[model samples]
Target chain A: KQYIISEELISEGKWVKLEKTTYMDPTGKTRTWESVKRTTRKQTADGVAVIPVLQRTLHYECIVLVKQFRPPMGGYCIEFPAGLIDDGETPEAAALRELEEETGYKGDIAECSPAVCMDPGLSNCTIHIVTVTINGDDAENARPKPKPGDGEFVEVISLPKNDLLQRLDALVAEEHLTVDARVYSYALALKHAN
Target chain B: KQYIISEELISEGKWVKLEKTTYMDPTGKTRTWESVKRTTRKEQTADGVAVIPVLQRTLHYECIVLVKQFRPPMGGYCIEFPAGLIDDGETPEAAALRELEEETGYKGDIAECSPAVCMDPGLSNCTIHIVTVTINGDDAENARPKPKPGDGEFVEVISLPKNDLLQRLDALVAEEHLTVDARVYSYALALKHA
Candidate 1:
């Protein structure tokens, strides 16, 4: 069983807190590691959730992406519509809510990843990555679009299926955008999805 | 520029701590968010490396390394890269080399690698650097692989052909469930970008 020997609060800040953990590794050896995890304002979400959008383009279906500025990264990042899992809500529901709030599209989950940790070595933060199919023809779905509020400004972007890798490169090299690994992975995964 | 009003720590722990942050958003609006942080020993390269180790057989193929244990946040065996927490002063090249040598006891050439990319910005400030490593046919044929997991833990190393991934994926699912890492899935898909 995974057992923690001891944990100590290293540093505390307004936005994040640091901790040092001494635990038994899989080898039964005692090791210490530090981790950072994100907390929520209210008991809104249990974990982070993602909604990967595959929508109909002019000729072929494309991936729907969002561009928003993250304070930590200091630049606009291109990623899928994601949100925190609110209390009393399923990850699917949170994905649907965020998919609509960030972009004007409604979607259904095709598949979902486990609440995955981005860096198990560095943080306990976890997210559920879901592949979503967009309902483009639904009038009710497209009726209302995401209106920025609470300092949220998201630009919806479309990526052609064939040119996913190229577009990802262009976003970083030419336009200076910080691209998310999940988005890039989605593009990479599409190649073998046949 | 955004301004920070006051920062407060919420919870105290050894490996993880929670803090509440009140800051001004870019649009002149004030917002508060909580984050969890970790303590670093030297320099926080807490930067990591994920390897897409490829071998040139008749067709190019890749190896799948399995970390079979009860994952902390999520329980169950997880399929991921031969990844390691990198050194603060080590470049991606050096970090990549260490993990390869540690996991498989072999040397490889870096075919390609991406800069540090954040996986889930909303969840926590966690990022990973991905690299594709190649051991050409001549080297791969002569190399002896003793996957001792260098960390003194149990591990399974499954070498796979590039084009046979989809088939293997089906087998993996039909038998038992596997939590596939996003970055590993990306490389698997890249092999069949047809």
Candidate 2:
């Protein structure tokens, strides 16, 4: 049998379009969900792509500073310094700039990693991930200049490579750190540190 | 010492305004942040606001499908239904209406929750969460209408309270799921089961 398309006045003020959708059931043919809204595609912003927040470990030496004091969480969080890609700036440049600005660290820009950040269904912004080796002197001198509108008071701390895992574990246990930040940081630590 | 504003380009980019800026550094401060671009108001999208992708758990016996795929370090990865904010529509109702159409089986009108969806910014992009309970038989039957997209696959499996932790661990170790998803799911599982 052919499926029929029909329109229904669901409510006095609302109207919905319905189409008989066919589904093959194990027992027999079944009718379900007629195309209702016919879904209109909407255009979205193409701005500020951010990489999944990640960190790099310096062998068994250092763990990048993961600050605390985020108002929304009402506590501290373990995360890397990340920002949106500015106009005309490549992800690599943004990554380098953000790392130094946020952590007060400088490093040699490495090759861009294959990792990508996703919005899933929100805006069309895509985050790109890249890695850099933090130069010790540069790291010591770097101080983050918060973006004009961003109101963040960052407290900087460094952890050893071995201790990084332990600190992360404790944060997760205490519900202090986000899982995404932890996982991404862990992967980055392992990827860069020996 | 007072610092002089070199130039403030406005309108035609030819007109310039000069002003005095105070040096705030206690230790005889020097100028920072050269090449400043100032505007009276930041440019905003005329169409709509960005959506923050988030998901919520109903403290009920429900299943979140996860796909198992190969990862370089971990052999497999599992993930939940992709979710994100609604940009085209200004309200969550409009965004969720659109999201439901893209994810999971599409049927039934999206009834609003008692309280608006919860939001968390511990991570990035205000993470909005919503829940649904008492799904109608017809709606459940009509679910799974569309095939999974290329980026992810769907594996429909019920997540019972007792086994939620085990499943999360498996996802982390096996699928190498992102930290955010892992933590969120684990927290939800613990809250629900507890």
Candidate 3:
């Protein structure tokens, strides 16, 4: 705030932008850092989305985790149900949409955190971290399982209450799965809750 | 139980790379998703991130130390955990102590740590290891931490009670207009699990 000298978009892509900025560092030293600006516009025509942070079901005794082979990671990524915020749609609504699309669990938001920066040091992308609450009052037969979108194979893993973190470790030692940092942090906190 | 199948570097910069991959999803479904490769060591496991805590008595429960910095990506202020990057050959344990001292002028013993986790698999290839610590000493300053680094790191230390995290975050965002990262905010939620 008040220290930005100038900024210009050097290059633009379908989902990201390369921006060069002239700014002062913490020591009052003039330094320039190139940051990638996310220009994905938050959602797709099909109405799906990707949020970096999600807390699954405060009502249930479990959390919803999504596992898929992310092209960037080049491996399986264990994260929360992530989708996009539709145009004119609030974050909690998008969170519910993402949850159902990615994991097929109909739910609502218990609360939602502010839209937060993901990798501030490297990119200008932000996400709405939503804390969730599930909706399941009907019979078990009336519920549907996870229905991933076309070309998407998302594994919806539910962790037992108070065992999210332990399950992560077992997923590693047993199944050799990689956990996402945002998803793991919530589990880690539960592991440390005294 | 997995590794990168094949990735073609589409673009390159000093610290980031644009890549396309043909990887096997969880269901062995060969799918594609474009992502950014962060500047970190390439290994079977993800890179590590250390979390340092400067705890104190706040009405007998507890409190924590967070740092605010001018993150250029967000073009605003960002509050986050006292964290540092893990360079090659340096253990996450070592980096935690060093980062705490350099960034916050504090020190503590590593209380716990989580496994390697991805920050955002859909966008970047960044793995993070979370290390929790218990600070030492009795005073405002970190008890005999270590030698201070060069001044002007541009970090503002905020010591908050264990409970008022949600309210304080809202106030800070509303009044100060500061945006926090996912990791820091989630930890705040966990700390408030009183």
Candidate 4:
């Protein structure tokens, strides 16, 4: 059984709403939780749309990555260009837009691959993976124009495919590259370059 | 110019906190977010450890996905398991333990993977992916003994490996899969099983 308990606007600009409810647990005890759902109309209220934010590899043998300090991790992390989908936009479009916006790289939207990253039991969000390709020239001209909304002081770095893979492998060994974006990027790189 | 902004927590709890901070945005506007961070340490709080919540796939051939209802354009959606960093835990073990309790399912130590999921600019969180492999027989014994936290429900489903990789799963690529969890699970099944 399901019931809508209560709803309230939590954030104005983002049109986010908090919904609370009580339900029966599997053992038959009542449980409750508060969920923050986005009501932006253009995006999933629950931040549930999964899309890959892609970056084109430059110089045919290298790709761009960002080494930015994350407040959560309290240190700099190496990551690819990526973001959630805006309302009314396809995950593919979001990928293309995020790729260009984050890393200043433009690429043709090739076929999107199947991949989903999630941590079910906490927040309701998922990320999708898309494999993108572009003319080598497009990648070469790519620059970093990291925006605040995109995070902070994103240091754009280019690495040879093998070197990047090695670094990624090292990160894996060190238990650093243990998230969906890094894994998907590493997997795609291994499939294409390795 | 980038100014480092730091905060001191005045009070905290399992899922909420209050802090003092000073920072500036790119527009030269002084701003602050309530800054809700999940701790992964079970009984202690440490300053710089990042703890993320994750779930294991109990059924090898099947996946558990969150089917989001009331998306604006799609009306409803589905995606893979939802997770985030444990704001209160200091280690991944603590964080994973808390996530397992909060998200609910079998009790097992999750294996860390070499991938991570990033939150988009429009959203306000980050996630990483980990895998817990459950064999065929384990699937029968691993049914969830508790309900999910919020209005979410875990639907276990199976996808043919080839069909998931090709045409059947294309429905998700074309924006046909409205549920966020469904989309993520489909993609994950294809990649892992393919």
Candidate 5:
């Protein structure tokens, strides 16, 4: 049932490869489109984004996010704790590992979403959104620090779950942060979630 | 101050080009990273826009409109908010209004629009504004719609009730073997659990 006829390699970069795909349209017309593909994806997913929820009590909860400089956008971006999935790594495990590495807090995976695409119109990279629970009452989580990799500078921010959209707006105005679509959409959902 | 020292085009495709950016990190260290850039972007506006249109189905419930289409990069149909690239000199809000009506055939009022948000900022310089639109189902104008998607677009419109969006998305994945966009999934996750 696939309409794609062939995908030709256009060019290869260090981390991504470009391809020109030829496919038949619904009206039997052939068309070509360009897409970027990741070179390091080995597992079922290319990466994982962890939504870390710091829960000290049933009434006290916050969502942990990370702010970092992204070269592609040439700006500081606020997003969920995320990283590429290593070879043979499951999305859940990768999410947990990335969360700890980026936020210096261990977490338990509460739920893992199905594989989802970002920039589907441009890139083939896929990631799973994992919801994780960080016990804020735990001694290890009291003094959190990020162990970002070399050249990776990540700032961890925990915002109260009361009004996510408001907190995000405040950050954008005060810190001049560019929010990731995943984060913005989540905020929107929460804002409209009555 | 800008940290980017220079950007050299590594490869150029029909729609996108790959570049190697030399930049100085916050640690005062020089670094190089690969990024994909859109060749068609010629305006200060966002490259694209996504509309999250909501319809008041009943006094007790509401539904969000979505579009399902074959994403060439994914090699399968994907569920995503009605989205498209902004035409040259077009505002993000105008693009959202056009795309939402074109793909879903629903005339909606733009309630809110997000700041420019990055999508896959790790890989591409793509950014889009997310617009929230409210639709009055009782309006006669919205009672019947004739969607006129472009030749390249083979879209199927869907409306999922807010209460069961996550479950509905899961069922689509299991029953139809379809992929979900991260933005859509995050929104659904919030609507369901947030």
Candidate 6:
């Protein structure tokens, strides 16, 4: 274990804040690291992402994914339905809201993972992974749902669970959309297990 | 499609820079979005890479090599793959090999490499390539050696069986109370269904 000596604010912005922290390494050497943080840290978790699986039949199951133009990436990114966890909101609650708002599907929470770091070397943001189950035959899920905020735009796509990785690769070539690391890793994990 | 109007520098740190970009969405409404950028990116190669080291044996099941170290952003010891940023004129594969040897003390062969994948696309432009490396368990060089960690780094190497990895990772998280990187978590999570 190491000892943190001090932390200083390096810069501040509307959405992000930078800080430098000094700590003693295991070899008794002192070092400083510059890391970023979010300005809105009202809760333990910064956000929540929903891994929604739609079940239409015994042999037919799909994963609901969304794509939108992200300003940071400067292009459309295929990602799971996600949103910031507001104050006093549970991760499950946030996941349900985000999935409905972004994908027009209401899902039931199946499992929620502990807080996970996004990019530990660069930022202090952490989000919870919420697994949800969607019944495709539900009346509410058959029609389109509410719109996102004025600046938010999301396009929903459902892919068979067995054919996810190949589908993602094809979508990248045809639509020129970047796949999020989380989604890509999930597909890769499935392949790795086999 | 969205049109970018202009970008203004909000703040700049030694390693990170913040920018506010004004863009017109498909609805023709203009809005400003704040995003983070890394200062170390160069050329077309990825900025960083994470290596999945798999120990392959003739008779035994495969094992994966992982690392645990203290992360300033998490303020706790975190479990992750051996990874580092690519140096000038270095490909993602070369960087993965270099980082794997330094962090885990084993040389591995590149088995698979992913394209550039965005991490935290909504907040930052940072990207990393995931490289899967294979280590022959019978090779003499596969034996553990003293790792070469940087000044502030103190990495502990761990090897887990390829089978039931998600369950093992879950147990590790509960027993050690260490944060798992999203890349690792997503892979482990999907391994459950795979």
Specify the highest-DockQ model's number. 5
Ranking by lDDT: 5, 6, 3, 1, 4, 2
- Candidate 3, A11-111: lDDT as tens digits: 66566666778787755678776777767564322122233222334443666677876767666777777765667787777777778777766665566
- Runs in model 6 lying further than 4 Å from the true structure: none
Question: What TM-score fits each model?
Answer: 0.76, 0.37, 0.86, 0.56, 0.97, 0.95
TM-score of 2: 0.37
Q: How displaced is residue A83 in candidate 4, in Å?
A: 4.2
- For candidate 6, the chain B TM-score comes to 0.94
TM-score of 3: 0.86
Per-residue error (Å), model 5, residue B49:
0.4
Expressed as tens digits, the lDDT of each residue in B8-99 for candidate 4 is: 66444344333444455555765443333434334432211122222234444333322232222122343333343545434545554444
- Model 6 CAPRI rating: medium
Local distance difference test values of all predictions, in order: 0.61, 0.35, 0.67, 0.42, 0.87, 0.84
Per-residue lDDT value at B194 in model 2: 23
lDDT of 2 by residue, A90-137 (tens): 667777776665665655565443223232211112244444556554
lDDT score at residue B12, model 4, on the 0-100 scale: 49
Model 2 has an lDDT value of: 0.35
Which predicted model would earn the best TM-score?
5
Give the clashing pairs for model 6.
none
lDDT of 4 by residue, A1-194 (tens): 33333443333323333434344434455556544344444443322221222334443355456655444443345666565577687767777676766666666665554434333233344455555654544535444344435335555555555455466656556744322343343443233220
- Native contacts present in each candidate (fraction): 0.25, 0.03, 0.63, 0.06, 0.77, 0.64
| Model 3 CA lDDT for position A90 | 71
| DockQ of every candidate | 0.30, 0.04, 0.57, 0.17, 0.78, 0.72
